[PDB]
Amino acid sequence: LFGLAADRHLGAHIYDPANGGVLLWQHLFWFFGHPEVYIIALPFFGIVSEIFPVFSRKPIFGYTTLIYATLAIAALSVAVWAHHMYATGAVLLPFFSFMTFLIAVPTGIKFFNWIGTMWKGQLTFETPMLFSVGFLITFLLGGLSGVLLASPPLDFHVTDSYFVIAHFHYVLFGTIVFATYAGIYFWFPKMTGRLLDERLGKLHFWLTFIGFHTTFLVQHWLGDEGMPRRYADYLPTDGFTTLNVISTVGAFILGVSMLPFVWNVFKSWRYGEPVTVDDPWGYGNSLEWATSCPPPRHNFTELPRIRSERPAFELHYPHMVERMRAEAHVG
Amino acid sequence: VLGLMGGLLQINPIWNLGPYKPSQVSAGSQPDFYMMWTEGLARIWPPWEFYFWHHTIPAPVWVAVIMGLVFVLLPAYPFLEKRFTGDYAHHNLLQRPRDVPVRTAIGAMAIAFYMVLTLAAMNDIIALKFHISLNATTWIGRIGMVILPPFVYFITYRWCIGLQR
Amino acid sequence: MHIEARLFEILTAFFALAAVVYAVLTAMFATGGVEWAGTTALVLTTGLTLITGTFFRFVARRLDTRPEDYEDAEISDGAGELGFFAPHSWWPILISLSFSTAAVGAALWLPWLIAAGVAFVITSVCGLVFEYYWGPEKH
Amino acid sequence: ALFMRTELAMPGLQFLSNEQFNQLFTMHGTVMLLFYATPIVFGFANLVLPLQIGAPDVAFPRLNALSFWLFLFGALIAIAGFITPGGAADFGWTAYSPLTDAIHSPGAGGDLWIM
Amino acid sequence: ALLLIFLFWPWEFKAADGESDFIYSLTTPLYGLTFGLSILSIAIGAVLYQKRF
Amino acid sequence: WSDALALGWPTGITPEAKLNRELWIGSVIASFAVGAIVWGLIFWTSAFHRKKATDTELPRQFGYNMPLELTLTVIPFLIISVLFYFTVVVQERMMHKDPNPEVVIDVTAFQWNWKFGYQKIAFADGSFDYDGADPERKTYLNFDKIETLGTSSEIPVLVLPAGKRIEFVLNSADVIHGFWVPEFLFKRDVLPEPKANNSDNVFQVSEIQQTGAFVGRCTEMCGTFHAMMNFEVRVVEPNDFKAYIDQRNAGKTNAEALAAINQPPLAITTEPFESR
Amino acid sequence: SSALLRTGKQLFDTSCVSCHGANLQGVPDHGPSLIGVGEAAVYFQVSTGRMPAMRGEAQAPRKDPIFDEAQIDAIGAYVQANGGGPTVVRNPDGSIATQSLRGNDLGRGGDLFRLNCASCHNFTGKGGALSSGKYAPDLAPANEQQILTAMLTGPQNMPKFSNRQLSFEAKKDIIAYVKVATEARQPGGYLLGGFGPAPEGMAMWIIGMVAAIGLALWIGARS
Amino acid sequence: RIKPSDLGRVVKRKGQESFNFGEFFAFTKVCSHLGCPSSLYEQQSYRILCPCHQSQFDALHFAKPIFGPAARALAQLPITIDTDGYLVANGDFVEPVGPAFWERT
Numbered sequence A: 001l002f003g004l005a006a007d008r009h010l011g012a013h014i015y016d017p018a019n020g021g022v023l024l025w026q027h028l029f030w031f032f033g034h035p036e037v038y039i040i041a042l043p044f045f046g047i048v049s050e051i052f053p054v055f056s057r058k059p060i061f062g063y064t065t066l067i068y069a070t071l072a073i074a075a076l077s078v079a080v081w082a083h084h085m086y087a088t089g090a091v092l093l094p095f096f097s098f099m100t101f102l103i104a105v106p107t108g109i110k111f112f113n114w115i116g117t118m119w120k121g122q123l124t125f126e127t128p129m130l131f132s133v134g135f136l137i138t139f140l141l142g143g144l145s146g147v148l149l150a151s152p153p154l155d156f157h158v159t160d161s162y163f164v165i166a167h168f169h170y171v172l173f174g175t176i177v178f179a180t181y182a183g184i185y186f187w188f189p190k191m192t193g194r195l196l197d198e199r200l201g202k203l204h205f206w207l208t209f210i211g212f213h214t215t216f217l218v219q220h221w222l223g224d225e226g227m228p229r230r231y232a233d234y235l236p237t238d239g240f241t242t243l244n245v246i247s248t249v250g251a252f253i254l255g256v257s258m259l260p261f262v263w264n265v266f267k268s269w270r271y272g273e274p275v276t277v278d279d280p281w282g283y284g285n286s287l288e289w290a291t292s293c294p295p296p297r298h299n300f301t302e303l304p305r306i307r308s309e310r311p312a313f314e315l316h317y318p319h320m321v322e323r324m325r326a327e328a329h330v331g
Numbered sequence B: 001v002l003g004l005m006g007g008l009l010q011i012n013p014i015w016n017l018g019p020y021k022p023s024q025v026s027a028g029s030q031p032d033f034y035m036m037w038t039e040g041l042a043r044i045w046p047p048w049e050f051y052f053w054h055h056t057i058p059a060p061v062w063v064a065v066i067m068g069l070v071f072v073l074l075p076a077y078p079f080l081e082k083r084f085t086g087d088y089a090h091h092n093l094l095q096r097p098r099d100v101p102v103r104t105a106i107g108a109m110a111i112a113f114y115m116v117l118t119l120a121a122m123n124d125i126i127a128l129k130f131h132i133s134l135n136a137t138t139w140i141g142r143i144g145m146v147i148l149p150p151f152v153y154f155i156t157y158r159w160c161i162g163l164q165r
Numbered sequence C: 001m002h003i004e005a006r007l008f009e010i011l012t013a014f015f016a017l018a019a020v021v022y023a024v025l026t027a028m029f030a031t032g033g034v035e036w037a038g039t040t041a042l043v044l045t046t047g048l049t050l051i052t053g054t055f056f057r058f059v060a061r062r063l064d065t066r067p068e069d070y071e072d073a074e075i076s077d078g079a080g081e082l083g084f085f086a087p088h089s090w091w092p093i094l095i096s097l098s099f100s101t102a103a104v105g106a107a108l109w110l111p112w113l114i115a116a117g118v119a120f121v122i123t124s125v126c127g128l129v130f131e132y133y134w135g136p137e138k139h
Numbered sequence D: 001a002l003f004m005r006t007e008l009a010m011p012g013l014q015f016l017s018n019e020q021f022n023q024l025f026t027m028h029g030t031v032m033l034l035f036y037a038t039p040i041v042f043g044f045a046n047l048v049l050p051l052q053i054g055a056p057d058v059a060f061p062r063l064n065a066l067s068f069w070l071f072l073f074g075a076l077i078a079i080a081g082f083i084t085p086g087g088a089a090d091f092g093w094t095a096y097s098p099l100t101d102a103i104h105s106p107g108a109g110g111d112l113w114i115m
Numbered sequence E: 001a002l003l004l005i006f007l008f009w010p011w012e013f014k015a016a017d018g019e020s021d022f023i024y025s026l027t028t029p030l031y032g033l034t035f036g037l038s039i040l041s042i043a044i045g046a047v048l049y050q051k052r053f
Numbered sequence F: 001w002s003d004a005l006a007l008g009w010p011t012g013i014t015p016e017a018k019l020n021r022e023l024w025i026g027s028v029i030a031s032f033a034v035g036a037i038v039w040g041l042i043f044w045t046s047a048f049h050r051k052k053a054t055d056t057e058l059p060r061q062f063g064y065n066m067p068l069e070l071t072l073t074v075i076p077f078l079i080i081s082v083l084f085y086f087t088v089v090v091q092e093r094m095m096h097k098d099p100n101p102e103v104v105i106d107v108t109a110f111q112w113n114w115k116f117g118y119q120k121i122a123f124a125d126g127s128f129d130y131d132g133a134d135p136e137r138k139t140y141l142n143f144d145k146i147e148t149l150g151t152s153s154e155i156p157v158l159v160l161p162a163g164k165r166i167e168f169v170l171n172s173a174d175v176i177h178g179f180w181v182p183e184f185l186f187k188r189d190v191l192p193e194p195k196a197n198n199s200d201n202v203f204q205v206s207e208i209q210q211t212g213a214f215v216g217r218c219t220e221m222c223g224t225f226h227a228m229m230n231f232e233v234r235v236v237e238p239n240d241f242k243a244y245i246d247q248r249n250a251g252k253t254n255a256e257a258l259a260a261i262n263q264p265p266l267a268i269t270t271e272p273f274e275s276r
Numbered sequence G: 001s002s003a004l005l006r007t008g009k010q011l012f013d014t015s016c017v018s019c020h021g022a023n024l025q026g027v028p029d030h031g032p033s034l035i036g037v038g039e040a041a042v043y044f045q046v047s048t049g050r051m052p053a054m055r056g057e058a059q060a061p062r063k064d065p066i067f068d069e070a071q072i073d074a075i076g077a078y079v080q081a082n083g084g085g086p087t088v089v090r091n092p093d094g095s096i097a098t099q100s101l102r103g104n105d106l107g108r109g110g111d112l113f114r115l116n117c118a119s120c121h122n123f124t125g126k127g128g129a130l131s132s133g134k135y136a137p138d139l140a141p142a143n144e145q146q147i148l149t150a151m152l153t154g155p156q157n158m159p160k161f162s163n164r165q166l167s168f169e170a171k172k173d174i175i176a177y178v179k180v181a182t183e184a185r186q187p188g189g190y191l192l193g194g195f196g197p198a199p200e201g202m203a204m205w206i207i208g209m210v211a212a213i214g215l216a217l218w219i220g221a222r223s
Numbered sequence H: 001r002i003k004p005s006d007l008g009r010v011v012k013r014k015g016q017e018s019f020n021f022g023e024f025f026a027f028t029k030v031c032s033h034l035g036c037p038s039s040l041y042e043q044q045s046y047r048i049l050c051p052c053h054q055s056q057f058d059a060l061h062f063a064k065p066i067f068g069p070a071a072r073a074l075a076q077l078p079i080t081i082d083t084d085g086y087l088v089a090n091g092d093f094v095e096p097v098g099p100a101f102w103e104r105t
């Protein structure tokens, strides 16, 4: 950006096409821009992996496996930056294509560990669990479309179309929006001392889910037949005038879906069922559910003895450590 | 300090201008910063005139009465405050501005009003250096003149009580 | 600290491998030879992780076991006095305002605004650094 | 995004322009990616990381507030290109190579975007 | 220095585009820079004397 | 049945397009199978294990299943290796660039329209040889003799024969544009100076089976009128193409040269934009 | 080789026809006709960089030029061949005059500038703001031929000064005054931008008052 | 001097239909608010701008004010040519020029 500002305010000949100025900018920008999407993707994986065991009444499946998958995704995210520049005809295609195919694996092991953590538990679907399941579904579909996008001979047709828009909207929405709503509904008591309403939460979730899946699903078909991104107008002689209407109906449903959430937050911050205990979602972990519900300044009045990665669970259920250590390896 | 800044900075270069002639004009026509509020008030006041039998009351009359009202409300403030609060005792110890929230809020509101009027006087310079429309700056001033003072009052009241706590 | 150093060593090894492989695979098989823009970023991210890992390694070799690094430990081990954590301060918002002034003065090319922003940044940073070291007034 | 959708239905330019549409999708992408997601990450971090590791505070407590205020004022600077008569930035979110030059895209919204 | 500058400095208006003077453009800045700085130094010395003796 | 599993891909008018479509269909079916499996797993575990029934102590605290994780980390590697091999094969095939073409077009993209060149015509039949290069260049751009230039009031129509090797040479005057014909199932970026940026601006088409009219779009960010750079492609018979070329050699517009071979003079897939 | 405007109508066809037409006819959506205009209009519009323009709004701004190596001449001759507009001044070599367009009387030039030009720009040629977007730019980086062609062709929202109401001596004297006013020293210290009392009030409040209040804080105790 | 292209958007105030000579109109130059010279003339918006407090008059609609504290139109002067071809005045203003006062405009 400093190079660009120098070029704009001093005429600095840094990015002229006469030099290698057209591909230089793209290389730099995408070397920045793929780690950015992984930056905004990983912590929400963490959030959902942290919500699942509380409502499944089970430990997290494959702790060290999840840690290694995270490290692998991190290491691989910086050496795939050029799968955004297939259509320029100026990159080494097999390298980046193969390495994106490679980065597709650790996400798969992460997904399987989540499904395993939900396997044969005692499920109860309060709003955080509901939003986490929605995240699962939406992210799976988005990642499928992405790994489809990762092959060069197919990106030779679907790039710069609405297929790409549908893909990254699936992944972005399913990750940030759903995991963020899950985290809000999960940690609202631990920061406030109140409880958000649940009927409004279910209404909010269903509105969001329906509107989203109705606004972004038809764009795959809309972009497979020729309609590129970033067009302001099109002709009636072209096709695809009903799909745009369906998409805008879905967008307006998504827009209306935000009123229940802000109403719930506005009412439940001041009124709303107070929390006079630790751990309003029983069977909690992570040492944050072992301090008063609105934590004091400096966060702690006493600490428990730490022996595993579920210290609060072993604090509130001391008759469980023998059974947690005995049958921790059946699988 | 005065000698230094009278030697190093240039003020009023009358030779770049010319002698006064009623037919020519320039673009920056501002007075010194202590009349800029008078100029800004003349700029952002709407064109309300009255025409009745054989006569005319133009717009700058409004500027005249508002100016006079300000100059009359300034010297008569202590008597207003003693009539409103009802306190008539001798005082030799000062007050911290955080212990009197209402007067501090009134003063902050007046200062915000003065700042709006002063900035509305350099419309041309602001719209030229910072790329903003000119009509936009006129309307910004015309609306700020009503909505900025009360906002400043509210914030100043709450801030004073926060300091007390 | 032993595990942080190992993490950074793993990352540095992988990054160096990828950098060398990319360089030698674009030296051949490429349109114009070595690509020269991804190569540089890769060697210097390798250098980043290498610097951090080497510092952690030295600090680990120069240290005795710590209640955090140590299992088997109890809360009576860490009983003591921690460092100094700054309570309330209002200088950050002034630093941000000064930097924003300089940035908007660089966006619209206005040199006087840039000069004012730089002066304000120097003043605010000086205020932040000296906040807990000014002595009582001398009268 | 809602403005974009309601224009994209019903072929023909009903109430927008080409410039305004370009500015709309540029600012939509920019805001949604850089002024909502990257800071919400640190929001959740500042909320529940010290609680989870059992610490009383973050390492540097004033750098925290500095980060928050820098974020807020940078976002406000970048958004304030709509009050310019020419509008906000009109290139893509990605700012491709020669389109963001001085010859092409000469307005005063790209400068505010960059800073 | 103020006295010497006031007595022996080229002060007349010489402006043109042939002989770029640049010596006349420095005649008032020098007056200010010497006068103000001298009296400022005197004031600072006095303040220090009051504060320390 | 296959129009559905193609998700709206237009059928090709080129062999490589048909190979691309075959690969696309196969990969779509594979991904759908994976998604169906995993969605079944999710719906199952949420429909039956949901029973926090009348009775409960606590389910079970198990967390490690080493062989299962090894299995489910070894299978996706093979599943991606198969398709990596296939995609390498197909993308190698689609960029052959045989040395000797038969028609060579010079596509220039400037600010919000196109301009085509007709650089060289040399049939393998020995039936028609022609050279349209020009030292009119008094410097990377190419200038020709027969140039169909589009304007804001007429969609530039490109005419080509059917069943011949075509070669496209892509150059831009100001910024990056995009050259997409949705029927070729292929696209490429039109860079300002493709040689200083180490990009190859040349791709070939083996043959065009079907005749008719096809639309093309720009697929980049050009600026204001990016959505208004459309063109058209008319694929005609070789002898009709020869008649078109020799009637164009005598000074004549594109409209009349198209009308003289009993074809509509204007573009039939696209109309000029009123809202410009 | 003046019988060569094949270049000219080689660059126009690839950089202008999308907004002016193939026959210089003014596409009824964006651009004007460009028939009555001449070589001077093309020279001023392209050499300053305002030409080939992106989206186009209340004011096309000044940018970096695209064309030189004698192709501004090419487009200028091609456009002059389709009308009878004004032409650019030339010196006895055939190049564009720079030095011959400076007059010798600055009093008359300055009086003419204050009467005709200073209303929109400034006393000394700084900028000025017009209504609803548009502004009047600064006169510092424009050379002599650009000043002449600017007041001769009357660009967007700027009035058009013919050679009958503003003779050639008048134009030369105005050029001389502008070029002298932009290159003279400030014989009173650092001028604060060229404008009136707004920078002066700001400099007072942000230099003198902070110095005075800082010395007041240093001298006097706080309690 | 108004371009011959438009010459159809003029509105011609009720008492001054014949005050113009072809494409010449000759309004006054003293702003009708406080008396600064209204000299900023934008040639293709046909707007006159007073630089003192930024009023705007519509040169195509008998100099009617369309922005700011200005409330009265600019006065128009009647013009013609004489037997030799020079521009002369065809009378006087129909009303006082400049700022207003108690008596009348």
Ligand code: HEA
Pocket: A037, A038, A040, A041, A083, A084, A100, A103, A104, A107, A108, A109, A111, A139, A140, A142, A143, A144, A146, A147, A149, A150, A155, A158, A159, A160, A164, A168, A171, A172, A175, D093, D094, F031, F034, F038, F076, F079, F080
């Ligand atoms: C927040 C997130 C985000 C995430 C997570 C991703 C994830 C991925 N993305 Fe995406 N992407 C974007 C955001 C994101 N992307 C954005 C914003 C753009 C373009 C923006 C711009 O251009 O303007 C983009 C564009 C983009 C492109 C180029 C589009 C172009 O042509 O222009 C490509 C492919 O190269 C791509 C690929 C991938 C791949 C391979 C993944 C993989 O990470 C995902 C793998 C995921 C899975 C879910 C697999 C599930 C695993 C199992 C179930 C095992 C299954 C196994 C087999 C089928 C093998 N992305």
Ligand code: HEA
Pocket: A165, A172, A173, A176, A215, A229, A230, A231, A251, A254, A255, A256, A258, D001, D002, D004, D005, D025, D026, D028, D029, D032, D033, D037, D092, D093, D094
């Ligand atoms: C993290 C990110 C993110 C999110 C959440 C979104 C959210 C949405 N996006 Fe966006 N989008 C991008 C990232 C994101 N997008 C990116 C990166 C691009 C492409 C960038 C580019 O090309 O440059 C893009 C481009 C893009 C396009 C196409 C632009 C183009 O033509 O190419 C479209 C529409 O088709 C779209 C639609 C939507 C819709 C309908 C939502 C819906 O999710 C949002 C529904 C939201 C609401 C309606 C808010 C509710 C508002 C009201 C209640 C109004 C109230 C008002 C006040 C109180 C102020 N996005």
Ligand SMILES: CC(C)=CCC/C(C)=C/CC/C(C)=C\CC/C(C)=C/CC/C(C)=C/CC/C(C)=C/CC/C(C)=C/CC/C(C)=C/CC/C(C)=C/CC1=C(C)C(=O)c2ccccc2C1=O
Pocket: B033, B037, B070, B073, B074, B077, B106, B107, B110, B111, B113, B114, B118, G198, G201, G202, G205, G206, G209
């Ligand atoms: C405090 C007082 C005003 C209360 C009066 C009580 C009131 C009820 C009486 C009635 C008054 C009426 C009703 C409304 C008043 C509004 C207006 C019309 C009054 C006219 C004159 C008025 C009385 C003068 C008071 C104005 C006020 C006291 C100014 C003081 C400002 C403060 C205390 C300075 C502190 C230190 C200072 C901030 C140093 C930093 C520099 C900053 C940037 C100064 C800001 C600044 C200023 C203030 C400029 O004037 C200015 C002018 C031209 C260009 C730029 C600037 C500029 O940047």
Ligand code: HEC
Pocket: F111, G011, G012, G015, G016, G018, G019, G020, G030, G031, G032, G034, G037, G041, G042, G045, G046, G051, G052, G053, G054, G056, G060, G075, G153, G154, G155, G156
């Ligand atoms: C549609 C984008 C566009 C492009 C591309 C363009 N112009 Fe312009 N041109 C305009 C517009 C709009 C105006 C109206 C002047 C104004 O409002 O600033 C104009 C005005 C002009 C004028 C002055 C008209 C007058 O009456 O004085 C000339 C001369 C000119 N253009 C020539 C050119 C040249 C030379 C090129 C470079 C080959 C070019 N145009 C490319 C849009 C464009």
Ligand code: HEC
Pocket: G048, G050, G059, G060, G061, G062, G113, G116, G117, G118, G119, G120, G121, G130, G134, G135, G136, G137, G138, G139, G140, G141, G142, G146, G147, G150, G151, G155, G156, G157, G158, G159, G161, G174, H040, H041, H042
């Ligand atoms: C407010 C009406 C107005 C008047 C009166 C006026 N100008 Fe302009 N001037 C403008 C506008 C508006 C532009 C910008 C035109 C453009 O950018 O296409 C301009 C542009 C210019 C430029 C180009 C500046 C540059 O850096 O390219 C010059 C030189 C110039 N005028 C000189 C003059 C002279 C000399 C006079 C007096 C005879 C004058 N102007 C009178 C409004 C005016």
Ligand SMILES: CCc1nc2ccc(Cl)cn2c1C(=O)NCc1ccc(N2CCC(c3ccc(OC(F)(F)F)cc3)CC2)cc1
Pocket: B029, B030, B031, B035, B038, B039, B042, B064, B067, H052, H053
């Ligand atoms: C609008 C101001 C302005 N626009 C511009 C534009 C450009 C430039 Cl460069 C400067 N300016 C300025 C300007 O300089 N403003 C300062 C100013 C304002 C008003 C007065 N007036 C004096 C006496 C009158 C008066 C006299 C007798 C009275 O007695 C009665 F009738 F009984 F009430 C009442 C009022 C009112 C105020 C002086 C200076």
Ligand code: FES
Pocket: H031, H032, H033, H034, H035, H036, H038, H050, H051, H052, H053, H054, H055, H068, H070
């Ligand atoms: S004097 Fe013309 S607007 Fe007040």
Ligand SMILES: [Cu+2]
Pocket: A084, A085, A086, A087, A159
């Ligand atoms: Cu791309």
Ligand SMILES: [Cu+2]
Pocket: F177, F178, F218, F219, F220, F221, F222, F225, F226, F227, F229
């Ligand atoms: Cu395009």
